[PDB]
């Protein structure tokens, strides 16, 4: 309802900046997914950067699963494809190709 993405986006990155442990990472990510605002690739990249800061690969797996299934959004796929591949091959957190065939 006529709410700017930029303010809350910047809040998400700035909270990710001072992520001391995984608790604030978890709470901020849950709040971000709480809105209907589908996360941007930039905020997901910042979240993965915070997760790499806190060193818990399961957070990365969970957020990838959340991106794959968060909202129907008229069943858009290629957006999901790019938003996953850019952040997979930006630095490397190889996690999707193992839980699926198990």
């Amino acid at each position: 309802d006529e709410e700017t993405f930029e303010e809350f986006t910047a809040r998400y990155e700035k909270e990710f900046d001072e992520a001391y442990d995984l608790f604030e990472v978890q709470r901020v990510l849950n709040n971000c997914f709480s809105y209907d605002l589908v996360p941007a690739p930039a905020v997901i990249e910042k979240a993965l950067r915070a997760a790499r800061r806190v060193n818990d690969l399961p957070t990365a797996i969970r957020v990838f699963e959340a991106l794959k299934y968060k909202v129907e959004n008229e069943d858009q796929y290629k957006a999901y494809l790019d938003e996953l591949k850019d952040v997979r091959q930006e630095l490397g957190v190889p996690l999707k190709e193992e839980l699926f065939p198990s």
Binding site: N30, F33, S34, Y35, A66, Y69
Partner: protein
């Protein structure tokens, strides 16, 4: 007439007032049906869709569009379900020359109807009781627990008034088929003008507890033509 077994709808109509009541009933029940269908399907789809929802939309509080929509819809819905009730009350309660007037008093576990509008031989007032025939002393071919020794008669295609009262305890004049239902106050009278357009036998029992022996309250209404009514009056 007789309550049809295993029924799931109203009894057969006998008078324009009762069929108008039925029309108002079905008109109301149409919108009640659509409302209940809407709410039931909403419940069903919610429970069958969001039961698997992993993350809950917990920051939605305002919803102005739906707020105004279901704030303004019920008003017009209620107005359009209330207008037919008003017009039917106006039409039915119209006291358009009730041509017949008889007494109907709810006594202690019986009725003693007195016919004072008409006479029997010369000016006399015709009155008689209505006793329910006992179940053990039933005659073969009758209706159990309700059938009376003698009942009331009524002309067809006319207008009738049922003067209702009581003696010791409040009774009820419950005849759903004839579309009349007025309480029997101990001292206060009530006038209802019942006009009948269909012949037949209309049953009835008092819809008000009369202490203990209210399981057998005979109110049987038999409709006859004008010559038959004259013959009955001459016989009575």
């Amino acid at each position: 007439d007789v309550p049809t077994p295993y029924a799931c709808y109203f009894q057969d109509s006998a008078t324009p007032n009762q069929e108008g009541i039925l029309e108002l009933h079905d008109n109301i029940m149409f919108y009640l049906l659509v409302i209940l269908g809407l709410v039931s399907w909403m419940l069903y789809t919610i429970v069958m869709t969001y039961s698997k929802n992993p993350i809950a939309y917990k920051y939605i509080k305002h919803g102005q569009t739906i707020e105004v929509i279901w704030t303004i819809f019920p008003a017009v819905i209620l107005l359009i379900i209330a207008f037919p009730s008003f017009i039917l009350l106006y039409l039915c309660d119209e006291v358009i020359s009730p041509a017949m007037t008889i007494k109907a008093i709810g006594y202690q576990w019986y009725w003693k109807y007195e016919y004072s509008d008409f006479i029997n031989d010369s000016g006399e007032t015709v009155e008689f009781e209505s006793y329910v025939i006992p179940d053990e002393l039933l005659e073969e071919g009758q209706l159990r627990l309700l059938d009376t020794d003698t009942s009331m008669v009524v002309p067809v295609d006319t207008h009738i008034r049922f003067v209702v009262t009581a003696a010791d305890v409040i009774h009820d004049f419950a005849i759903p088929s004839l579309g009349i239902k007025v309480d029997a106050t101990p001292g206060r009278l009530n006038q209802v003008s019942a006009l009948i357009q269909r012949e037949g036998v209309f049953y009835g029992a008092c819809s008000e507890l009369c202490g203990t022996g209210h399981a057998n309250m005979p109110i049987k209404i038999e409709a006859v033509s004008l010559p038959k009514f004259l013959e009955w009056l001459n016989e009575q």
